[model samples]
Target: STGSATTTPIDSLDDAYITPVQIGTPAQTLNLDFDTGSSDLWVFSSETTASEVDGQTIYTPSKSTTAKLLSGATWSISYGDGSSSSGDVYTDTVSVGGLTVTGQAVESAKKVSSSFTEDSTIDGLLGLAFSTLNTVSPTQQKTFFDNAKASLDSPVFTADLGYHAPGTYNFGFIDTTAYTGSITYTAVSTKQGFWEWTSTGYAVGSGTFKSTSIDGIADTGTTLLYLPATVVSAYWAQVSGAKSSSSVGGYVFPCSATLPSFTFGVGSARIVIPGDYIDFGPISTGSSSCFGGIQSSAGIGINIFGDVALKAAFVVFNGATTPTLGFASK
Candidate 1:
């Protein structure tokens, strides 16, 4: 079976994409962030303390007759910035687009940090990563895609993110009319429960492609295109008055600087990230310098293909027997 849904950015800067999901029998509609970087279908619910709740919607389990708590099951996940949420787990029918998974694992947050409570837009996260990364204790529960894949025609999904627009997510198939040119599929390594792959090299503007290799993960939840300092430095060097400002945490350049487009080799194709996307807005109020989207990943130790780089192309998350990632120019 096939279904489609749209994920729109919650912030002025496309920080994260949140999609609507219906849960339980009465169907409590919640806007959950679609994050491929982590595995956990967690939500803010009646179980959450009143102090932790802000201007957000909550899923009340008692109101849903179909709700069944997974006895003794618990889960917790922490983000990169130390934001965390933890609670108990349940199995209920969670529907997205037009597909439904009856026993999908849904973690109800009983405690959440101020970091999550401050974000009133997103109710929780719908993890698209492999099921092995689920954080449930006593027993590991499967993710939405993992459960839905059983009945999916081909168990595949596609992400088409358009700048400042509602991007579509298609499950079980690809929409040929949605993309331009051909798509190249690359075999992926899920050893770390991530959509990890290697780059064939990169090029700045219209320059030659450097024949180097960079290992990275395609993380839709991540914000910037974090790469090796060697590559990132090469990108900023092309801009005027660019520097790795310690105060700003990373590289920044004058707003008037002409940013050159960046290209990275993926599969047999090279995806180009327009320079405009690299200028991540001004650094501060009335500031002339802007933050660079392509920054060093030395601190994290792993290159990340995040929102900035992902917005440039159409991506396919294949759940086939061997699993592969397909890229197409959008």
Candidate 2:
């Protein structure tokens, strides 16, 4: 049978989407950030240092009958944001939507960065990327998706994100009604451990369809869309007062600037993002300058078709014989 779950916005920021997962025997339900960019099913746990723990609901393996310590196993990961979390590993019964995977590796965090402690809405991260990227020591562990793939009705999962609205993460099979038109398929390069693929090109507003193959990954975990400097500059040129700010660390424009719609090519198909999505939010609570959602992936070293682009389409992460990605207009 297929599995399905709802992705709810953790706070008003709309920075991340939280999908609730039932872990342990007592079924401790925690709202987890489902990340497709990394592979580590870690959690804010009872073992976390007191001062480092804020309002997060920590997982207590001792309280779960199904929880078992994976002896000598440990896990650690330093995120792109320069924040980190690390701890020992435990095997437990973990369930999402209608799928249950026993002996799932649950990395219990003993220490977390200040940023992690401050985000009270997210209990932990449930990574959906390639399991090979998992950071467990001594014995690398398989991700929840990797373990559940065998028994899944179809070896795939779908991520449907909507701006300012709740989304859905359905495992096993795609929901036809979740999208419009047919799914556009593309070959994925799993060698990178991310859903790496090539985009035909992009169009700014209702502008020309520039023909250039752009390589990037579909990163649902990231809040913004990061592209090469060439593409970013072209897009920002359209806004009146849009300028790259050194202090704020990216482009910021007048809050009243007229933003044009961004259209990206998924194969021969076109997926367009609304102009408002790129407006992002203000630099500060009362500031007149707003951050641009499409930033240059300059220091990052790679282009990222993050949530800003993802929310505009219904995506399929196919993990059958040969991995491929599917994108469809919605």
Candidate 3:
């Protein structure tokens, strides 16, 4: 009980990544990173000159008799990280795990940044990840799931990022058999950006950030834990050997010694990302090297609970139910 394929974008940033599956016999591919933080699928196309593509995979409509283009219309999207890409719009048959869907909107890239273009493996991004923090409009562009949701066997949508492996993420009904419990829920806020969802409240260790503060939001589009400057500095103070380093991108610290087990209490659901994330910290982009949990925000207000936190639990996205988000584990 699922539908067919389509074209979409895939992100290759340090924070988020998604790839779209083309629904064809052999499934002509359109690998992209779909962000619930945003809703749109873009890919490179045949019409795109060599300069338009940053070495990412592009789905050629000619490759599949089922693929169709959207009248030469173009689209470009900007990531919170300041990365952006532009391309033509098209509709096509896309496939993922035997699910084939039609009228799938795809963007054909014509220009991308050097950072995006240089990556031989890095592909376009899918803004399916929704958050109160986005400026992308139409707010609800028909996405891969939007078209296929009706055909799904179950009404539930679960994403298993780092499922069987670290990067091979999947979107669909999670193997319900793998879980054994009631789902934990979180309501959405009207904030803007990845950190748009004001965490009604959160608790770390035995304490809470602010019993009523909307501290952060859960974001797969963002990779690390971007916390408030003041809050982060205070939290890091408890982390052993965790000293402030300007080169470390701010609140990062060395977890070489014993690290504290930090718990993020999202609503009534408390998720604890063990010290390993911190213990495993190796420096990057200069500095003493702390876990990617804490870093400088590019003018974006609010904290981003990235993969380090998302991977720690199972997230249930129930857009069908007033665009609510829930979490669960077995």
Candidate 4:
């Protein structure tokens, strides 16, 4: 079996992408971020206090006959950006596009931090990572993808994220027309609960590729590309008036600066990110100061290929065997 869904950018040019998903018997639908960085299907629900819930939609499991509470079960998760949520668990029918998985563990949020509440548009997160990364306590839960993979034609999913447009998330099968050129395969290490891959090297502008090995994860939920401080400094050095800003956070530069392109190496495959992609929009509304999309992950300990980098390529998250990653130009 195969399924597919259109993923729309939160804004015309925003870094985050969301897709619609249905839960429970009567099918309560919500817009959820398909995150490859973590594994746990969670949503804002009736379990959440009214005082904490804002403009976001909530799932009322009581209305669904198929909703069954997983007694004594609980879940809690924290993102790289410091957002967190904790909640109870429910067993319900979860569907994405034309695919449906019955009796999937769906974490219903009872408490969500301001970071999650403020993002009124995203109702929840649909984790696409390995189930081993799930945060459910007592008995870890399997992800929607993990539950559905058994019946799929192939145990794989493809993410085609776009800029200022709609892309697609294809399950079970790869769509040849969605990408150009051959898909280059690279070994992925899932020991870290992420799609971690090693970059043989990277370069700015048209400079020669470095021979350094950088280990990083392909995280769809994150908005910015994070690399080492030295690597970030090297890229900033090429830009005039670029400096690290404590007040504004990360590296900032003139909005009009002509930024240089960045490239990452994966085995023999070379993924090139355009200069404009590295220049995240202005820091403040109507301000000439812009934030660099490639920031330092100095203390974070792991590099992140967030939406800024992932949008430039068509990525295949393979669950077969050793969990290989396939990349191709979009």
- Whose TM-score is greatest here? 2
lDDT (0-100) at residue 81 of candidate 3?
Answer: 73
Q: Candidate 1 has what TM-score?
A: 0.97
The stretch of ten residues in a row with the least summed lDDT in candidate 3 is 4-13
Per-candidate TM equals 0.97, 0.99, 0.80, 0.97
Error of 4 at 80 (Å): 1.3
Ranking by TM-score: 2, 4, 1, 3
Clashing pairs in 1: none
- The per-residue C-alpha lDDT of model 3 at residue 186 equals 73
Q: What's model 2's lDDT at 20?
A: 92
Query: Candidates' lDDT values, in order?
Result: 0.89, 0.92, 0.58, 0.89
Weakest lDDT window of 10 consecutive positions for candidate 4: 9-18
Better of 3 and 4 by TM-score: 4
lDDT (tens digit, per residue) of candidate 1 on 151-255: 988889888876767898889988998888998888789999998888888999999999888899888888789999999999999998999999999999998
lDDT of 2 at 255: 83
lDDT of 1: 0.89
Clashes of each: 0, 0, 47, 0
lDDT of 4 by residue, 174-289 (tens): 99998889899898998988999988888999998987989999989888899999889999999999999999988999987899989988787888989888877788889898
lDDT tens readout by residue for model 3, 134-237:
22234325666666677776544565455223333334555555445756777665344232454554445556555556456667666667666665665667
Q: Is candidate 2 or candidate 4 better by lDDT?
A: 2
